[PDB]
Amino acid sequence: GQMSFTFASPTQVFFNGANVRQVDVPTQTGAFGILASHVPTLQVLRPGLVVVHAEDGTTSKYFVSSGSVTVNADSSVQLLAEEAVTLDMLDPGVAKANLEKAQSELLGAADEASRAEIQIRIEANEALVKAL
Amino acid sequence: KQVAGTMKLELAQYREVAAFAQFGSDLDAATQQLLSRGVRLTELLKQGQYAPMAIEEQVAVIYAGVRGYLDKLEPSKITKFENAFLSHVISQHQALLGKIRADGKISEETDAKLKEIVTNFLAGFEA
Amino acid sequence: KQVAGTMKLELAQYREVAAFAQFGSDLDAATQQLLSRGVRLTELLKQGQYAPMAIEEQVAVIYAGVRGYLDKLEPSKITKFENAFLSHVISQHQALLGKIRADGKISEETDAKLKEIVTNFLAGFEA
Amino acid sequence: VAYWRQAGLSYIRYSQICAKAVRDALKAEFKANAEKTSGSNVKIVKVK
Amino acid sequence: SSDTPEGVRSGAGAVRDAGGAFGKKEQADEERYFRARAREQLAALKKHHENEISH
Amino acid sequence: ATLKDITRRLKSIKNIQKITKSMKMVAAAKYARAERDLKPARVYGIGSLALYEKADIKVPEDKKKHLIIGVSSDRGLCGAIHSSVAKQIKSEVANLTAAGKEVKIVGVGDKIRGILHRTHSDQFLVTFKEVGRKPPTFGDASVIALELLNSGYEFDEGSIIFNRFRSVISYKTEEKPIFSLDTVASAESMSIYDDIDADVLRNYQEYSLANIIYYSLK
Amino acid sequence: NIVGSEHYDVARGVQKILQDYKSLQDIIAILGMDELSEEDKLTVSRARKIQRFLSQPFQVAEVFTGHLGKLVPLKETIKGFQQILAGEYDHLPEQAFYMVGPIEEAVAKADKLAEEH
Amino acid sequence: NIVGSEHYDVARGVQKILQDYKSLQDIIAILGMDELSEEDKLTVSRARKIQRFLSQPFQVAEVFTGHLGKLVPLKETIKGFQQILAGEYDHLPEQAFYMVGPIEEAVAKADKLA
Amino acid sequence: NIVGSEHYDVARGVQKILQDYKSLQDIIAILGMDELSEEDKLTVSRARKIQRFLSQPFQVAEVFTGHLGKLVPLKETIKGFQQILAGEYDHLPEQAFYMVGPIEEAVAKADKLA
């Protein structure tokens, strides 16, 4: 109650000043739930789906890629994300194939930071399939 | 008179917007269309020396352009398409160019009969 | 002919590139060697009135700037450089100018002999 | 701290890769909006 | 004037034939730009490997 | 003048007149596009800034390094746009040098570097050209902000200068600060906040650098 | 029908790119050279090489120039101009065609300018 | 020789800054003032005060405007065109140079429009 | 002092309103429509009523275009445009004014639409 939820891509805007009681965000260092007066933090995101529960009967299943959640002192949040798409624009069939090919290059990485780049890529496709 | 009355109006709308062609990509899709028809109507107007045509062959080439049957063909190919299309309709559609020469007008029967002709040729053309 | 032929061709490349009065790109190594040499060659061509120089004295002024011995000086002082350098040649180096006149051409013995005196002057003229 | 930490990376270098994978899992219809953003146009000029 | 066949109308290539301020600003901009392209096309023309073996 | 002299000068100002009419309708259809694409990028630009106003943050007494980010285009014919931001960058550098701070500046346009090539050719960090031909996007705000980190220059305060417009007629050159350092962002107004460490605030304060550039570029 | 169809479509191909170069100079006077697109930065650079390739060192003008007298045959004049139009010499600067004979000396003069950097 | 080497050098600097201003009037009229250089916003900003400093209130035209007729000596119209061509008076507007005598009344007019 | 004050202030306002539509037709063509004020939307609507009320079917063309040729006296034309300016007949659509005689036959043509 008496909240404000803002959800904006760089090119488009989903929510402006319209809050619905509960926001689920995948944090880099875990996960959290927003329930009308959460103790404010400054967190950053991991690849994972955002399921905003509208009042409105049902929920809203978005899927962010990397953004920033700023819940602040007054009861108002500002969730800004870079690639915030829904579910139906994605195809599951291409997401299955992209996993094991990046696992195949993981053994074939000679350097230490180039292999660390491969570990970033397999994590994002892992949250891709399990969200589907 | 029937086809060239719209061609005269179509070319006159092009000459208004000829000064936007040198730097134009951020314009409206109607203005991009008005440039697209004006270039392709111009290539129909070019003509070699000592080759005078007939009025029944002239009205067919204008009918191919003013209807909209050329806005997907590349602007450099409009000359090669025209010399191919004219030698077709002389030998294979001689009985249509005797019903515009003798009739004088273009009826509703000849409007449909010319309509599948330029759709048959445009379908398999590039070979 | 051995000293003005490479003076004319360095002015012709100056007039083509120095018509802007509004520069936006700094081509400091590219053309500012060319565009700031022709400024010096132009002010070398100014003259007073009722003062006709001799022909062999004229070579000793053009050769001082076409091979690039003036490229360090300020542009406001090139006319002050010449009426001091005109005195230093006509008094102490008369037999040098007697060779340029009587032969009619400059040679390789005279070329390096003329190279030193402009360098001793420039090392002493500046204050 | 993670594997992209302590190996010498930045969070933009993290955020470039995980957002690039979402633009590869899109369909043929929404591939143009992945071509739309595609922000590789700024050139690099350092004087040395 | 120009909205009739009688009056004076301007053709293509009339800024250079006038020879004024804009006619001189155009000639020194085609030269100061295509001077740098005689640098990059000549510096990369020295990168022939067969010449370096001769060097 | 002669009749041949009058006619040739008259025809030349017909072509200059017809071309500036054609270049008015071209750059007005580029204006209506940039007005529609600003309003989604406004609230996303406002929201990323909105954390710092609900906190009393200021660079307190003295810090050793600095950055000025000069934002302009790679195009001319725009009046006094580039001259205003070149006037504001020279005012701030001459004022901060009274406090003994070392200043390094970076220009994201050609015509910023071309103006300042004489007086400040040794205070440049990097310069970014080919900006303004195509419309700016968020990927170009990530290319610039990535190379501002991995250069070797570890700075502690900074500010950005750009032209926030009020209307079709009147714009304004403005000033906004960049708290890039983690410890100046470690003050009394963050101890009220939650479990954020110096690793989480390291990742977060970097991402707001890419959100002030995309705000500035639009 | 007299000079053959190969000479004819080369002559009109030269005049069409020179006349289209004339209408482009009216834009560069207000915009500039660099603000043009990449497609018409090429038709200028093809036209400037066609202007300079037409100039030939004459024989009776040796005392003006000092250069030597060239005499290009007819079959070589067409084949020189097909290759600048088609784009087979986009890797040379403009100065490599000034006061040359056939197209063979246009690349020999191109390398001799390179080494003095 | 006849008028000197100091009179002849200031009088040729005035005809140099007024000729370069005359070659930029074809561009300032089209593209405005904001398309020039930075060193060519100083030839314009100085020739527009030498032009107004070649105005003088005559003695027989007292019944036209009601201004006093002013006379200058020859040694003081050399000093007035050195302190403008050098850049001593680059903090005054152009209209302060309008219809005065010697150079001392130009600074006694710019204090009025303060 | 020739045609009187009744003819004057009617025919003066017609050419003034026909200029404002000529100046506002350029912002609408370049920028767009809805940005202009609500007081200007009536001047756009009224000036398309006036420039169609100037049309008139002639008696020499009765055979071709089929309409009836109308000969309007002077006191009807001044009475007509005195009411279009005041917003008195503004709620009627545009095609009631195309090719009519006096203002009386205008409202008799709004009934036949739909």
CATH classification at residue A69: 2.60.15.10
C25–chain F Cβ distance below 8 A for any pair? yes
Question: What are the tokens at H90?
Answer: 């680059």
Domain around F188: 26-218
Indicate contact of D with A: 3+ CB pairs under 8 A. Answer: yes
Contact residues, chain G, for F77 at CB < 8 Å = 30-31
Rounded CA separation A41/B58 (Å): 77
Domains of chain D: residue spans and CATH: 1-48 (1.10.1620.20)
Contact residues, chain F, for D39 at CB < 8 Å = 136-143
Domains of chain H: residue spans and CATH: 1-114 (1.10.1140.10)
CATH of the domain at A107: 1.20.5.440
Looking at the structure of chain A, the number of domains it has is 2
Size of interface E-G (CB pairs under 8 A): 55
Angle F200-217/F40-53 helices, nearest 10 degrees? 140
Which chain D residue lies closest to F134 (C-alpha atoms)?
D41
Domain around A7: 1-90
**Chains contacting C (3 or more CB pairs within 8 Å):** E, F, H
N- to C-terminal Cα separation, chain C: 34
Percentages helix, strand, coil for chain D (3-state, rounded to 5) are 40, 5, 55
**Distance (Å) from the alpha carbon of A73 to chain F's nearest alpha carbon:** 8
Q: In terms of C-beta density within 10 A (0-12 exposed, 13-18 middle, 19 or more buried), how is residue G47 classed? A: buried
Point out the annotated binding site of H for ADP: 64
Question: What are the tokens at H26?
Answer: 């074809």
Which chain F residue lies closest to G30 (C-alpha atoms)?
F16
Interface mutation vs chain G, best among E42, E52, E54, most G CBs within 10 Å: E42
Nearest-by-Cβ selection for C27 from E28, E29, E32: E32
Q: Residue A45 carries which DSSP code?
A: B
Task: Indicate if A38 and A86 belong to the same structural domain.
Answer: yes
**CA-CA-CA-CA dihedral for I28, I31, I32, I38, to nearest 10:** -70
**Chains contacting G (3 or more CB pairs within 8 Å):** B, E, F
Yes or no, beta carbons of B24 and F26 under 8 Å apart? yes
Nearest-by-Cβ selection for F10 from E8, E11, E15: E8
Point out the annotated binding site of I for ADP: 64
CATH of the domain at C39: 1.20.150.20
**Half-sphere exposure (CA, 13 Å, Cβ side) for B115?**
8
Contact residues, chain E, for C22 at CB < 8 Å = 25
H28–chain C Cβ distance below 8 A for any pair? no
> Which among I72, I20, I76, I29 is positioned nearest to I48, based on CA atoms?
I20
Question: What are the tokens at A30?
Answer: 């875990």
Characterize C36-75 residue by residue with b for buried, 16 or more Cβ atoms within 10 angstroms of its Cβ, and e for exposed: ebbebbebbeeeeeeeeeeebeebbbbbbbbeebbeebee
Looking at the structure of chain C, the number of domains it has is 1
Yes or no, beta carbons of F11 and E22 under 8 Å apart? no
Which chain H residue lies closest to C48 (C-alpha atoms)?
H1
In this structure, are residues D6 and F108 in contact, taking their beta carbons and an 8 Å threshold?
no
Contact residues, chain E, for C25 at CB < 8 Å = 32
Tell the residue number behind the tokens 């010697």, with chain if given: H102
F42–chain C Cβ distance below 8 A for any pair? no
Question: What are the tokens at I36?
Answer: 């202009």
Q: Which run of H or of E encompasses F141?
A: helix F138-147
Task: Indicate if A105 and A68 belong to the same structural domain.
Answer: no
Point out the annotated binding site of C for ATP: 47, 49
Q: Within 10 Å of residue F182's Cβ, how many Cβ atoms? A: 15
**CA-CA-CA-CA dihedral for C1, C7, C9, C12, to nearest 10:** -130
Q: What is the experimental resolution, given in Å to one decimal place?
A: 3.5
Contact residues, chain F, for A78 at CB < 8 Å = 47-48, 50-51
Yes or no, beta carbons of B27 and F19 under 8 Å apart? no
Rounded CA separation A48/A25 (Å): 8
> Which among F44, F142, D17 is positioned nearest to A9, based on CA atoms?
F44
Question: What are the tokens at C54?
Answer: 């001799």
Domain around C66: 1-126
